[PDB]
Design a protein around this ligand. Structure first.
Ligand SMILES: *Cc1cc2c(cc1C)nc1c(=O)[nH]c(=O)nc-1n2C[C@H](O)[C@H](O)[C@H](O)COP(=O)(O)OP(=O)(O)OC[C@H]1O[C@@H](n2cnc3c(N)ncnc32)[C@H](O)[C@@H]1O
Ligand SMILES: C/C=C/CC/C=C/CC/C=C/CCCCCCC(=O)OC[C@H](COP(=O)(O)OCCN)OC(=O)CCCCCCC/C=C/C/C=C/CCC
Ligand code: HEM
Ligand SMILES: CC(C)Oc1cccc(NC(=O)c2ccccc2C(F)(F)F)c1
Ligand code: SF4
Ligand code: F3S
Ligand code: FES
Lengths: 239, 138, 102, 613
């Protein structure tokens, strides 16, 4: 036997004004998978089928299992269980987010912000679409690398302290990275007005380079660097 | 539905509900880049409080600067006491100065990787101790 | 496009490299002309500093107007008070020189 | 009654599923001008199309000069002549048109010196009708093609007034006298039940990989729309045909792409021999998925296993340059160290044949229309459509060709939109549904919400998953299959002794997964019974006792001095599966395969032949 302790955040919206309380679960690590998600699945399947959580790909390329493990916002299928048996793994939902149930946050606002930047190719002339492929060199293609890979797990935005206090008006790292993702794209023509949409003290300029967004990213991407690069474009673009 | 409408309908469902906010500051891991950002804001306010308190006293309080120093001279001039009080002036001043450069380096778009943050984070921290001890002995 | 928030960001970085340059310049040349430009740089950068603090913690639409007006009032008194010190007293360069050898 | 709040929604078109095919159908309908609602149990991005790594097939001709008619030949040959050639015609012809369409949406395709989309070699593709050798027509976004496909489809979908029912589990189809009127679905956010009525209904729910123990598919790939057509009494096609992807991690069952084999990755057994050249001489290690995985599982039979317990084989990337692994295959490179603890540059990947694709699903017209089988003839179900992995226009047949599903998604997703736009107009009369319609769907939900039995949901799930893995594997004998059939039937009788714990309304994952179990079982019954009845070795379905490939003629010898076998004698036909919900009785009948193309002059009909690479 090899016992590992898991302390998990629990809140039931059907237990008539129930308080948010922690619940301890014990798992034989020798008969379990290497990842945290495997352990969360195990208690759901064996110990208590009341733990509600988002899961899908178990591969680390969908962003459903995104949560706070031991003070870090990463994917439960990417982060492996701490082999040190003398420690209890504290499992929490994404920071400063509306809790629907156990570890399940309301991301409606997060996706809406991603809709407000318009994440699609915009051409000045649209009459020649769906017939001929647009040209892009391998040199121009490499500029998209490290930006398109974003899986929208919402780890970087929810780790940002500015997004905590100003979540309503500030878009956040994940969304801002995608705004930048369509800026450097050589095919897109609406580069100027994408920057003009950020011409307010809250949309972009609520970032203060705290740098919790890159430090917690499960895919190893650099949103903060991409945000600072927008700021440089904002001060240099003409007309 | 539109993006602006989706945000407006988000808050109406959450603010008028029993849904609690997830723990944030109580549970999140302490980062060096995060802690150094708090100290930058801390020193920023502390310095701005000092600068404003100096200019505000020049208008409200009577007497010139030459006479104001004499009040400090009136109390026993402790060599280990004056040095410590003088150290507590340049310590928040030089930290903000060296870390201010680090922010300006970031605004150029350089040194924004995790290893570079931890390296430059220590360099600023060390330069502060040296410049604070160094200036206190001027 | 009317880049108001973009030009404001640039100004903050402009006064920053200026204030970084002036501090050693005041040590080298502690003249009366340096006193006023240092008093201008200290107040402006400080005003735009707290301006970012206010827009972060103050909820807005009711307290936002009061806090931004209260800061502007303090900044106006600070710059005038420092200018008074440079004109009717030893100046901020000579103020440090006397204080540091105490 | 009076327990659940019913909220009726009125729309022009309902698209169940927000994957690849789902989105393309959804936004394409509003782009045409329809009031389109999209129902999905997950967020559109979380859909399993993101997991796609290989690529998307199109005969654009960027690496060398290419013809889409050769891509037709490769797919129909790959289908083991069970694939409907009219559907393959439509898919391959507008394959270059529909990929350019995606690139124009904003898809960051990998590039070359010319500036055009990067194409690559893939399993079972050949130039000049098979004679010309290796073909390069797999368009890829640097090993993250499916992820980038879904994002650029989702991104472009915000340009239109599509309604999105995000995290709404669809329970049953709204059906009135054979005609589909919409969907009755469960809200997960609050727990209410919504009836969404429309003139047309598209089903794009994907495969049912969760039926087995080891699979590359997601936790949500439970064939919900496949088992939704089941409860309506409508047939399901070719459900016994389950594709086994040769390369899948021994641990969690994660996928290592076929793009690894397409770039230069070789499969090596424990002996040290290049064993894939021994089985297949022509295509070698880059053969069809029904031959490569067949060779791998046979290595275990003679005890030639690479693993510590000798069960899996290796995929070698030791000889591959590190320059190519950073540009062409970055997605599999990072995921190799996570689940296996192996770097791709110095040591090979532990691979094993695992459940991957379901070509069989909902019987589908080349237009996208759902087909029912009445009196030995095909009839179009009014107001019901299907596209994607859940659908079976049988464009893949007995074995899916490499990197053809993402094409199957975009082309037939578009086709579902066009077939609605050209048949009826937006704003036309939405057929009124009965006041108490979907009564059994709600009554079903209420039973499992208050389920008090002896066997847990997950414990019955594991009993189903492990039974399918042992009885309906890569190789399966009649005696092994028959034991599985009466074993799964016994497990269906346990769906009344089920034990649930959660009894809330808001986000009941203990309830939705048990609904998935109802859907998984109904898919499992039709898979195992359809396999035991089929007495031949065709494509992915390989019988040990029946190694013969039974067609209307013996296509090995010339066709002339040979009388035609009766329809109910040969096995070159689609397996249509019905199952009674109350008893779990599987009843089977068969319909003819479509051999005729859309135009004989523009594309020649390819007759059956001896299949080997
Ligand atoms: C499994 C797999 C498949 C795959 C692949 C890698 C893996 C691991 N790589 C591929 C590749 O490189 N190239 C290629 O051409 N194909 C590849 N595939 C196959 C292909 O990607 C899949 O067949 C594809 O994912 C199928 O797409 P589809 O849109 O049809 O199905 P889905 O992506 O799984 O999305 C399903 C959606 O339906 C909704 N849903 C499901 N059930 C419900 C119910 N109950 N109620 C409401 N909505 C439901 C889900 O929300 C989901 O979004
Ligand atoms: C608001 C202002 C209120 C005044 C209080 C601020 C005191 C903190 C100053 C920190 C700087 C360290 C002082 C170093 C020193 O010894 O003075 C320089 C001196 C050496 O003479 P020397 O003739 O060069 O000496 C020759 C021997 N080397 O004399 C000078 O040259 C004058 C230069 C001083 C410029 C410093 C400006 C700081 C403004 C920041 C305000 C922060 C408030 C908190
Ligand atoms: C000459 C050395 C200094 C440099 C190089 C400098 C530079 C900077 C920079 C670049 C920022 C913005 C950091 C960010 O991105 O959030 C900042 C913040 C700030 N500074 Fe300075 N500064 C200096 C001295 C001072 C002084 C003397 C004061 C006191 C009046 C001051 C007050 C503030 C305040 C109140 C903030 C806002 C805090 C924050 O948002 O982090 N600074 N400084
Ligand atoms: C986990 C704890 C230490 O976390 C906290 C708590 C309180 C404040 C903060 N830090 C900030 O709040 C901060 C600091 C510097 C610049 C801008 C901010 C801003 F914008 F307001 F987010 C972080
Ligand atoms: S940028 Fe990184 S941390 Fe942020 S949502 Fe995308 S993958 Fe997650
Ligand atoms: S943490 Fe937040 S303030 Fe910054 S660099 Fe990332 S957006
Ligand atoms: S479940 Fe897909 S990212 Fe962990």
């Amino acid at each position: 036997p090899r016992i590992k302790k898991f302390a998990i955040y629990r809140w039931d919206p059907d237990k008539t004004g129930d308080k948010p309380h922690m619940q301890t679960y014990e798992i034989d690590l020798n008969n379990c998978g290497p990842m945290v998600l495997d352990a969360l699945i195990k208690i759901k399947n064996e110990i208590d089928s009341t733990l509600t959580f988002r899961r899908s790909c178990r591969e680390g390329i969908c962003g459903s299992c995104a949560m706070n493990i031991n003070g870090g916002n990463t994917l439960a299928c990417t982060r492996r269980i701490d082999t040190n048996l003398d420690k209890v793994s504290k499992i929490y939902p994404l920071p400063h987010m509306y809790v629907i149930k156990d570890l399940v946050p309301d991301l409606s606002n997060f996706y809406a912000q991603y809709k407000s930047i318009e994440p699609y190719l915009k051409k000045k002339d649209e009459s020649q679409e769906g017939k001929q492929q647009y040209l892009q060199s391998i040199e121009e293609r490499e500029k998209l690398d490290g930006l398109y890979e974003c899986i929208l797990c919402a780890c970087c935005s929810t780790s940002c302290p500015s997004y905590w206090w100003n979540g309503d008006k500030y878009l956040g790292p994940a969304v801002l990275m995608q705004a930048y993702r369509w800026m450097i794209d050589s095919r897109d023509d609406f580069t100027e007005e994408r920057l003009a949409k950020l011409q307010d003290p809250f949309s972009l300029y609520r970032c203060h380079t705290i740098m919790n967004c890159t430090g917690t990213c499960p895919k190893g991407l650099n949103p903060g660097k991409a945000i600072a690069e927008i700021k440089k474009m904002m001060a240099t673009y003409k007309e | 539905t539109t993006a602006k409408e989706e945000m407006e309908r988000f808050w109406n469902k959450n603010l008028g509900s029993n849904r609690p906010l997830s723990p944030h500051i109580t549970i999140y891991r302490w980062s060096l880049p995060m802690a150094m950002s708090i100290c930058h804001r801390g020193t920023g306010i502390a310095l701005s409080a000092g600068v404003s308190l100096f200019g505000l006293s020049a208008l409200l309080l009577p007497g010139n600067f030459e006479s104001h120093l004499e009040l400090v001279k009136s109390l026993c001039l402790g060599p280990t006491l004056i040095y410590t009080a003088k150290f507590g002036i340049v310590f928040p001043l030089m930290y903000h100065t060296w870390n201010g450069i680090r922010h300006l380096i970031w605004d150029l778009g350089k040194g924004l990787t995790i290893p570079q943050l931890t390296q430059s984070g220590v360099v600023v921290l060390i330069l502060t101790v040296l410049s604070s001890v160094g200036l206190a002995a001027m | 496009s009317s880049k108001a928030a973009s030009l404001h960001w640039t100004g903050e970085r402009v006064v920053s490299v200026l204030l970084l340059g002036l501090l050693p310049a005041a040590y080298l040349n502690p003249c009366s002309a340096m006193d006023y430009s240092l008093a201008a740089a200290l107040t402006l950068h400080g005003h735009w500093g707290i301006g970012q603090v206010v827009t972060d913690y103050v909820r807005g639409d009711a307290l936002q107007k009061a806090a931004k007006a209260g800061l502007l009032a303090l900044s106006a008194f600070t710059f005038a008070g420092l200018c008074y010190f440079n004109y009717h007293d030893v100046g901020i360069c000579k103020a440090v020189a006397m204080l540091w050898k105490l | 009654s009076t327990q659940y709040p019913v909220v009726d929604h009125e729309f022009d078109a309902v698209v169940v599923g927000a994957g690849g095919a789902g989105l393309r159908a959804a936004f394409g309908l509003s782009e045409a001008g329809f009031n389109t609602a999209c129902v999905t149990k997950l967020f559109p991005t979380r859909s399993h199309t993101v997991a796609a790594q290989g690529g998307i097939n199109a005969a654009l001709g960027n690496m060398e000069e290419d013809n889409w008619r050769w891509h037709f030949y490769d797919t129909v040959k790959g289908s083991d002549w069970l694939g409907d050639q009219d559907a393959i015609h439509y898919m391959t012809e507008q394959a270059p048109a529909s990929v350019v369409e995606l690139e124009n949406y904003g898809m960051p395709f990998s590039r070359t010196e010319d500036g055009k989309i990067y194409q690559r070699a893939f399993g079972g593709q050949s130039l000049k009708f098979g004679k010309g050798g290796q073909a390069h027509r797999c368009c890829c976004v640097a090993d993250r093609t499916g992820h980038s496909l879904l994002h650029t489809l989702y991104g472009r979908s915000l340009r239109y007034d599509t309604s999105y029912f995000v995290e709404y589990f669809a329970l049953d189809l709204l059906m009135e006298n054979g005609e589909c009127r919409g969907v009755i679905a469960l809200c997960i956010e609050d727990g209410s039940i919504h009836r969404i009525r429309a003139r047309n209904t598209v089903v794009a729910t994907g495969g049912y990989g969760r039926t087995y123990f080891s699979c590359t598919s997601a936790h949500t790939s439970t064939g919900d729309g496949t088992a939704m057509v089941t409860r309506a009494g409508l047939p399901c096609q070719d459900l016994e045909f389950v594709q086994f992807h040769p390369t899948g991690i021994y641990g969690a069952g994660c996928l290592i792409t076929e793009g690894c084999r397409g770039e230069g990755g070789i499969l090596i057994n424990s002996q040290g021999e290049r064993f894939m050249e021994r089985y297949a001489p022509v295509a070698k290690d880059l053969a069809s998925r029904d031959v490569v995985s067949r060779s791998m599982t046979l290595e275990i039979r003679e005890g030639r296993g690479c693993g510590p317990e000798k069960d899996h084989v290796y995929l070698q990337l030791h000889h591959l340059p590190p320059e190519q692994l950073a540009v062409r295959l970055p997605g599999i490179s990072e995921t190799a160290m996570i689940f296996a603890g192996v770097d791709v540059t110095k040591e090979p990947i532990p691979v094993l044949p695992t459940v991957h694709y379901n070509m069989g699903g909902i019987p589908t017209n080349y237009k996208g229309q759902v087909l029912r089988h009445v009196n030995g003839q095909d009839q179009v179900v009014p107001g019901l459509y299907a596209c994607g992995e859940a659908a079976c226009a049988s464009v893949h047949g007995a074995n899916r060709l490499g990197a053809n599903s993402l094409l199957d998604l975009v082309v037939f997703g578009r086709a579902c939109a066009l077939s609605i736009a050209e048949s009826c107009r937006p704003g036309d009369k939405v057929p009124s549904i009965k006041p108490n319609a979907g009564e059994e769907s709600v009554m079903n939900l209420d039973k499992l919400r208050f389920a008090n039995g002896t066997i847990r949901t997950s414990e019955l799930r594991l009993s189903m998953q492990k039974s399918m893995q042992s009885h309906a594997a890569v190789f399966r004998v009649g005696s092994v299959l028959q034991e599985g059939c009466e074993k799964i039937l016994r497990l269906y009788g346990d769906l009344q002794h089920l034990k649930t714990f959660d009894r809330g309304m808001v986000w009941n994952t203990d309830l939705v997964e048990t609904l998935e179990l109802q859907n998984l079982m109904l898919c499992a019954l039709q898979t195992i019974y359809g396999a035991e009845a089929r007495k031949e070795s065709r494509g992915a379905h390989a019988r040990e006792d029946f190694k013969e490939r039974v067609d209307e003629y013996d296509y090995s010898k010339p066709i002339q001095g040979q009388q035609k076998k009766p329809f109910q004698e040969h096995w070159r036909k689609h397996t249509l599966s019905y199952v009674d919900v109350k008893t779990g009785k599987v009843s089977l009948e068969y319909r003819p395969v479509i051999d005729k193309t859309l135009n004989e002059a523009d594309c020649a009909t390819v007759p059956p032949a001896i299949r080997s690479y």
